[PDB]
């Protein structure tokens, strides 16, 4: 029925949002720059 | 009819179960419909049914929250029926359980229940217990009043009341924060294997009483400390309901003669009285060390006492004894004879995926900031075990708590729920903890399914296909091998210059086949010979048999020949104790165990020819330095993860790097990437790698293989025709 | 059993052991069984404690007391007959012994049939396939295999019908069959406990599996069969039968199959000793294991004890260079000793094989040892064809395959090299057949391609040495 399908849509949104590369190069480069600035001072 | 076997779920949601479509058609329900579940002792629950490609037809997948309310355990069977007449509720009353409301005050409804029900549209039933996680606490609540009955869906426009003291947990229900299978991260395969061995004897003892089959009566677990050996043993007892008895070597050994034997006997007598029961003996090598390795009468006696108590398990109905050790061969071999501890499971060390799973498990309650990346941590935490990853999560939590909450709260045991929920852990707190922690298992070899795929290898197109023919075809098309009387090869040896991708070739086929990759290095073969520990060869091949499907890779096969002198040596051959034991194990290994052996060497001219005889590594593949088209392919493969400027001429670079190996082309790409990153970081105090970064990298990169080494390898390959 | 006695305190272990004998007498006739005997009465050199020595002496006196305890027989089980106090084997006591060993393929099939008597099997189940695949398994492993195969089937159906009660409806078990996929699955999960143990059995190699060498086949019949088929004629003519033969010649010409085939025809237990085993004994200075090997041969009689790669140790020492010494070593010396002391009527025949007779102690050729010599050269034209036909006897072969043409080209090839050609052609036919689904027989093109990758393993420098040696022997 319709109230059950709305309950299913809410459960699917919760599960998919929680359960669901150039970013790791960017993070590692920023971390290396912050460590170099911490060693020069 | 309409009876389904209770098993674990992938979907963690408190109102979701998963069925395979054939059962949804027979039950005349659709994806998203609400159903009622009927368990034991007149207990029911309401949930939404979804579907996936992992649930089997005979099973219904649910989480712990649903099983607890139905008073059922994994392996039981419940009834399912649709209820399309479910409507929205009007007013409900939900109260927390005292078992979790300790050290906390404030408006629990606004912090926990309201976020939990807001736009959630969750089906509930009177008496339902559900867990809400947040603020580094897990609080469970009970539904005590509903205007509609017995079940309804709670819509955002309904009234939710929460007035009264926390409710004391009833004896007919268990706390949802107790240790279960969902608390175990890596080694999921091992946990499944154990569950199959123990769940049925304990959950349905009647079947073993009536059916002429023997249950397992003892499982030995082994691996480094902190990997979950004791966590599994307890989690199994909690999930099946068997009484858990804890024993440990050093405590029993600390007792006086006669006291150690009496205490060990009592544990077995109590287990029978409390059957079904599980007896877990930790540090088995300490309570029962090899008798031939000790001098004491008490140590020889306690081994005899344990051996007789293990044999008595044929009379002590429904009692299973488990044990944990660091090394499977550090205990008296009598314990592993037929009967007694006739089963064992290799826990080992979690891999990169398992380490992430462990971090996710120990952050269930933690509020993480958007900058937190646990996958990056799991890849950096090489050599860490669950004990270390749990420390990282707790230490990162403490750092966030001290930065914010310790400037808000008093030095006391009670904190407002809103203050706890306002505290989120940032990536800096995880990085700090990572610098403080030190891996407890960094030297041990880690066996895992590799993430290397065929797209990661530049060149060698015919070798990639050849490995698929050697590894996959014997089991994908077995009727053709039988039809033509072909004996599949058990392995292949690679030879040629270093740094051409030999490691990727073995990993890539293991990846596609979803098989564990076992990497044995020269230093291990050298240790076995020099340390007079050739029995470790059996450990290696047994690891492959237990890790199957797997690829058993023996690197630096020349290390044994070199140990005998290599270039000079005595006047004899390459035969020695270690290689003879290795060859023996190869001959006794069947291809039907899903184990394929790959070898490699950089000095094929000194390999004991026995390894190339039929039944061993009879096939030879030459891996030269990459050619012109392959070197370009290697450069392109390494740059798939970063934007590359249009001014970069990869063919020009490949034409210059004529003597470079794949490993050297990778350094060029990685160095050019680092140079581009350096510029990017400075610009914020760039979006792509520029030609200047590759040309600068070329000033530092060198070929690892000399021209004389290339001629040596080419002449050898030519000699073989 | 060992642990039951060893777990008891001083004075309790001796009293309990004595009571066991007293009960057997009171209830005579009676049988006492002592399991894990080596745990109670280990070889004396393995223990020095006062308590352990006394309990061993108590067992020895109780065994001697069986002269008065009428109708009482004591049996004991150990893993190795030489791991126990040798005094137990004195006249009387435990002087008689029986080697149980491990089952062969026939025994394993019988065990599987026994432990499935109560089991419902599907029409696809074939326990002969299992018995042949379960190499290295013992009866306890086959029993576990049957249990695991049933348990998989039980979980699939018993839980599906939700039969949760204290009793099982007979109809449910009546319709619950264990399939061949359930046995094959269990075989993947099981792990043999005797994988590293020595396997001794009557070989399945037949003479039809060996191409060529018709005169060698007849010679082996005279050397192995006649001494026991006509023992009265050997006495009549004063003939002393040969106790063994040494094979020499190029490698890969069937030296091993010849020893197995005669063991098969004679239904004798075949014991296979390979180079790595001879090297292991040499490297570890454990040549005493040679006497154990010959003792097993005596226990297994009638038997054929085959020592392959006799030159493995001489080669390991340098073969062509090495030191300035002779061909004698720790292991071959014990082998020579055991042959010299072997009884003619024990029905034990020794076969050796070497690839370099010039580095084998010539003393091995004296009467009573490997006094006969058979030369096994590279197969000739008709034999190479016969070898190809034998190697392909298990596969479909197209009519366009000219086996005589292939044999004429492979003039310098050994039987081992002809097999590689056959297997290469099979692999090519397999790859071609599989591709046609993305063929029914091996085509000439598959053999012609194999000819471009196969090579002779024995070069002309070795064949000339082999022929010149054979000529020297006249
Ligand atoms: N495989 C694993 N998965 C999840 N958590 C684990 C794992 N191994 C260890 N842990 C965690 O690390 C800790 C181990 O402590 P304990 O249970 O005493 O085990 P040990 O036997 O290593 O001392 C626990 O907090 C446990 O949750
Ligand atoms: N053909 C190739 N394609 C892509 N990368 C390669 C190739 N050959 C080597 N590499 C890179 O070089 C590194 C070293 O490779 P490996 O096979 O481990 O060399 P080694 O001979 O030292 O074992 C790998 O991590 C891989 O990234
Ligand atoms: N006369 C022959 N007939 C059939 N096959 C043969 C013959 N000679 C050798 N072979 C093949 O060569 C392989 C090696 O034979 P074997 O006698 O084991 O060699 P070796 O005794 O030198 O180790 C066998 O598997 C067999 O298939």
From Swiss-Prot, chain A:
The UBX domain lacks key residues critical for VCP binding. Interacts with VCP through the PUB domain (via C-terminus) and VIM motif (via N-terminus); the interaction is direct. Forms a ternary complex with CAV1 and VCP. Interacts with SYVN1. Interacts with HERPUD1. Interacts with VCPKMT. May interact with DERL1. Interacts with PLAA, VCP and YOD1; may form a complex involved in macroautophagy. Interacts with LMAN1. Residues 3-15 are annotated as: VCP/p97-interacting motif (VIM). May negatively regulate the ATPase activity of VCP, an ATP-driven segregase that associates with different cofactors to control a wide variety of cellular processes. As a cofactor of VCP, it may play a role in the transport of CAV1 to lysosomes for degradation. It may also play a role in endoplasmic reticulum-associated degradation (ERAD) of misfolded proteins. Together with VCP and other cofactors, it may play a role in macroautophagy, regulating for instance the clearance of damaged lysosomes. This is UBX domain-containing protein 6. The lineage of its organism: Eukaryota, Metazoa, Chordata, Craniata, Vertebrata. Residues 4-13 have a biased composition (Low complexity). It is found in: Cytoplasm; Cytoplasm, Cytosol; Membrane; Nucleus. Enhanced expression in testis. Coiled coil: none annotated. The gene is UBXN6. It comes from the Eukaryota.
From Swiss-Prot, chain B:
Coiled coil: none annotated. The modification N6,N6,N6-trimethyllysine is found at residue 293. ATP 2 binds at residues 499-504. GO terms for cellular component: ATPase complex; azurophil granule lumen; ciliary basal body; cytoplasm; cytoplasmic stress granule; cytosol; Derlin-1 retrotranslocation complex; endoplasmic reticulum. It comes from the Eukaryota. The modification N6-acetyllysine is found at residues 480, 483, 646, 712. Changing residue 133 to C: In IBMPFD1; also in one patient without evidence of Paget disease of the bone. Homohexamer. Forms a ring-shaped particle of 12.5 nm diameter, that displays 6-fold radial symmetry. Part of a ternary complex containing STX5A, NSFL1C and VCP. NSFL1C forms a homotrimer that binds to one end of a VCP homohexamer. The complex binds to membranes enriched in phosphatidylethanolamine-containing lipids and promotes Golgi membrane fusion. Binds to a heterodimer of NPLOC4 and UFD1, binding to this heterodimer inhibits Golgi-membrane fusion. Interaction with VCIP135 leads to dissociation of the complex via ATP hydrolysis by VCP. PANTHER family: AAA-FAMILY ATPASE, TRANSITIONAL ENDOPLASMIC RETICULUM ATPASE. This is Transitional endoplasmic reticulum ATPase. The gene is VCP.
From Swiss-Prot, chain C:
It comes from the Eukaryota. Belongs to the AAA ATPase family. Its EC number is 3.6.4.6. The modification N6-acetyllysine is found at residues 233, 236, 399, 465. The lineage of its organism: Eukaryota, Metazoa, Chordata, Craniata, Vertebrata. Keywords: Acetylation, Amyotrophic lateral sclerosis, ATP-binding, Autophagy, Charcot-Marie-Tooth disease, Cytoplasm, Disease variant, DNA damage, DNA repair, Endoplasmic reticulum, Hydrolase, Isopeptide bond, Lipid-binding, Methylation, Neurodegeneration, Neuropathy, Nucleotide-binding, Nucleus, Phosphoprotein, Transport, Ubl conjugation, Ubl conjugation pathway. Phosphorylated by tyrosine kinases in response to T-cell antigen receptor activation. Phosphorylated in mitotic cells. ISGylated. Necessary for the fragmentation of Golgi stacks during mitosis and for their reassembly after mitosis. Involved in the formation of the transitional endoplasmic reticulum (tER). The transfer of membranes from the endoplasmic reticulum to the Golgi apparatus occurs via 50-70 nm transition vesicles which derive from part-rough, part-smooth transitional elements of the endoplasmic reticulum (tER). Vesicle budding from the tER is an ATP-dependent process. GO terms for molecular function: ADP binding; ATP binding; ATP hydrolysis activity; BAT3 complex binding; deubiquitinase activator activity; identical protein binding; K48-linked polyubiquitin modification-dependent protein binding; lipid binding. The keyword Manganese does not apply. The modification Phosphothreonine is found at residue 167. It is found in: Cytoplasm, Cytosol; Endoplasmic reticulum; Nucleus; Cytoplasm, Stress granule. This is Transitional endoplasmic reticulum ATPase. Its main location: cytoplasm. GO terms for cellular component: ATPase complex; azurophil granule lumen; ciliary basal body; cytoplasm; cytoplasmic stress granule; cytosol; Derlin-1 retrotranslocation complex; endoplasmic reticulum. ATP 1 binds at residues 79, 115. It comes from Homo sapiens (Human). The keyword Nucleus applies. The modification Phosphoserine is found at residues 193, 433. ATP 2 binds at residues 252-257. The modification N6-succinyllysine is found at residue 399. The modification N6,N6,N6-trimethyllysine is found at residue 46. It catalyses: ATP + H2O = ADP + phosphate + H(+).
């Amino acid at each position: 029925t319709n109230e059950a399908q709305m309950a299913a849509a809410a459960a699917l949104a919760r599960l998919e949002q929680k359960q669901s590369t150039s970013q790791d190069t960017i993070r590692n480069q920023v971390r290396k720059e912050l460590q170099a600035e911490a060693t020069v001072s | 009819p309409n009876r389904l076997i209770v098993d674990e779920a992938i979907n963690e949601d408190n109102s979701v179960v998963s069925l395979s479509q054939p059962k949804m058609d027979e039950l005349q329900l659709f994806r998203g419909d609400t159903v009622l579940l009927k368990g034991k002792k007149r207990r029911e629950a309401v949930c939404i049914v979804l579907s996936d490609d992992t649930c089997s037809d005979e099973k219904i997948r649910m989480n712990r929250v649903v099983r607890n309310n139905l008073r059922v355990r994994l392996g039981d069977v419940i009834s399912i029926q649709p209820c399309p007449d479910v409507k929205y509720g009007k007013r409900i009353h939900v109260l927390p359980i005292d078992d979790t409301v300790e050290g906390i005050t404030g408006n629990l409804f606004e912090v926990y229940l309201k976020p939990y029900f807001l736009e959630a549209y969750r089906p509930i039933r009177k008496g339902d217990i559900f867990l809400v996680r947040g603020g580094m606490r897990a609080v469970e609540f009970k539904v005590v009043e509903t205007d509609p009955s017995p079940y309804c869906i709670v819509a955002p426009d309904t009234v939710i009341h929460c007035e009264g003291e926390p409710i004391k947990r009833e004896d007919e229900e268990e706390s949802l924060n107790e240790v279960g299978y969902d608390d175990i991260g890596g080694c999921r395969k091992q946990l499944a294997q154990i569950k199959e061995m123990v769940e049925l004897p304990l959950r349905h003892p009647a079947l073993f009483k009536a059916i002429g089959v023997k249950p397992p009566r003892g499982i030995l677990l082994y691996g480094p400390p902190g990997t979950g050996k004791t966590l599994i043993a307890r989690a199994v007892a909690n999930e099946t309901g068997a009484f858990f008895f804890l024993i440990n070597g050093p405590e029993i050994m600390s007792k006086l003669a006669g006291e150690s034997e009496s205490n060990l006997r009592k544990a077995f007598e109590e287990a029978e009285k409390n059957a079904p029961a599980i007896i877990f003996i930790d540090e088995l090598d300490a309570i029962a060390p090899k008798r031939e390795k000790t001098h004491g009468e008490v140590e020889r006696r306690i081994v005899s006492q344990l051996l007789t108590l293990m044999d008595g398990l044929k009379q002590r109905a429904h009692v299973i004894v488990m044990a944990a050790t660091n090394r499977p061969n550090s205990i008296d071999p009598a314990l592993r004879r037929f009967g007694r501890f006739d089963r064992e499971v290799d826990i080992g060390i979690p891999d990169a995926t398992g380490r992430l799973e462990i971090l996710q498990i120990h952050t269930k309650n933690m509020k993480l900031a958007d900058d937190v990346d646990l996958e990056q941590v799991a890849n950096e935490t090489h050599g860490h075990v669950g004990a270390d990853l749990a420390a990282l999560c707790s230490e990162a939590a403490l750092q966030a708590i001290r930065k914010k909450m310790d400037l808000i709260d008093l030095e006391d045991e009670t904190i407002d729920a809103e203050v706890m929920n306002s505290l989120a852990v940032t990536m800096d707190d995880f990085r700090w903890a990572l610098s403080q922690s030190n891996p407890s298992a960094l030297r041990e070899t880690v066996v895992e399914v590799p993430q290397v795929t065929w797209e990661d290898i530049g060149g060698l197109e015919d070798v990639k296909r050849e490995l698929q023919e050697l590894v996959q075809y014997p089991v994908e098309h077995p009727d053709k091998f039988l039809k033509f009387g072909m004996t599949p090869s058990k392995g292949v040896l690679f030879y040629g210059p270093p740094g051409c991708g030999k490691t990727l070739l073995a990993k890539a086929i293991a990846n596609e086949c979803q098989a564990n990759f076992i990497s044995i290095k020269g230093p291990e073969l050298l240790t076995m010979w020099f340390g007079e520990s050739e029995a470790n060869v059996r450990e290696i091949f047994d690891k492959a048999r237990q890790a199957a499907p797997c690829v058993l890779f023996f690197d630096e096969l020349d290390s044994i020949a070199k140990a005998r002198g290599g270039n000079i040596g005595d006047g004899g051959g390459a035969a020695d104790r270690v290689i003879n034991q290795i060859l023996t194990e190869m001959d006794g290994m069947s291809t039907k165990k899903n184990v394929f052996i790959i070898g490699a060497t950089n000095r094929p001219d000194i390999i004991d020819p026995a390894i190339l005889r039929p039944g061993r590594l009879d096939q030879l593949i030459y891996i030269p330095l990459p050619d012109e088209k392959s070197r370009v392919a290697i450069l392109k493969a390494n740059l798939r993860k970063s934007p590359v400027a249009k001014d970069v001429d990869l063919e020009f670079l490949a034409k210059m790097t004529n003597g470079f190996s794949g490993a050297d082309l990778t350094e060029i790409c990685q160095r050019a990437c680092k140079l581009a990153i350096r510029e990017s970081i400075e610009s914020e105090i760039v979006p792509e790698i520029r030609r200047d970064h590759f040309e600068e990298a070329m000033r530092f990169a060198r070929r690892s293989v000399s021209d004389n080494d290339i001629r040596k390898y080419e002449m050898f390959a030519q000699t073989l025709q």
